[PDB]
Design a binder for this molecule. Structure first.
Ligand SMILES: CCc1c(C(=O)Nc2cccc(CCC(=O)NO)c2)[nH]c(C)c1C(C)=O
Ligand SMILES: CCc1c(C(=O)Nc2cccc(CCC(=O)NO)c2)[nH]c(C)c1C(C)=O
Length: 127
C-alpha cells in the first residue's frame, strides 16, 4: 500500500501574500486548534498505510490536515484568508465523509470544528 504525496506547501509559481486575516489565521486560529486536546489525529496527513485504511485515498481525493495548513501559513503560501479557511473546511469535510457518524474521530473533529467556527466568526476586517 502507498500514501499519495502530501499536499504541496510551497510553489514558486503561486503568488504569495500576507494579510492581517492570514496572520490571524496562523497566530490565533491554527495555534489554538493545534494545542487543543483532540488535535493529534489532525496534525499530519492521514497515513492510510500505517492506519490500515486502504480505501481512504480511494474515497478522499482532496486530503488536508493541520500540519499542511500550518506549513502553508508559515510559508505565506496563500493569497487570501478564504483559501486557508477552505483548507480547514476540507479537512473537516473529509473526516465526516470517510468516517461514520459518532465515530471517535468524528467526535474529535466536531470539537475542533466548533472552535474553528467560533474563531472565524471573529475574523478581523481586512486592513
Ligand atoms: C481514524 C483514522 C484517522 C486519524 C488518526 O487516527 N490519526 C492519528 C492518531 C494517533 C496519532 C497520530 C499521529 C501519528 C500518526 O500519524 N500515525 O499514523 C495520528 N486521523 C484522521 C483524520 C483519521 C480519518 C480516517 O479521518
Ligand atoms: C458524520 C456526521 C457528522 C457531521 C457531518 O457530516 N458534517 C459535515 C459533512 C460535510 C461537510 C461539512 C461542512 C465542513 C465545514 O465546512 N466546516 O467548517 C460538515 N458533523 C458532525 C459533528 C457529525 C457527527 C457527530 O456525527
Amino acid at each position: 500500500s502507498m500514501n499519495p504525496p502530501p499536499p504541496e506547501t510551497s510553489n514558486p509559481n503561486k503568488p504569495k501574500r500576507q494579510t492581517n486575516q492570514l496572520q490571524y489565521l496562523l497566530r490565533v486560529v491554527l495555534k489554538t486548534l493545534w494545542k487543543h486536546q483532540f488535535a493529534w489525529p489532525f496534525q499530519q496527513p492521514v497515513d492510510a498505510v500505517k492506519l490500515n485504511l486502504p480505501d481512504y485515498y480511494k474515497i478522499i481525493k482532496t486530503p488536508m490536515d493541520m500540519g499542511t495548513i500550518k506549513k502553508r501559513l508559515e510559508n505565506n503560501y496563500y493569497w487570501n484568508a478564504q483559501e486557508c479557511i477552505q483548507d480547514f473546511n476540507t479537512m473537516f469535510t473529509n473526516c465526516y465523509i470517510y468516517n461514520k457518524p459518532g465515530d471517535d474521530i468524528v467526535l474529535m473533529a466536531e470539537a475542533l470544528e466548533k472552535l474553528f467556527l467560533q474563531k472565524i466568526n471573529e475574523l478581523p476586517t481586512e486592513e
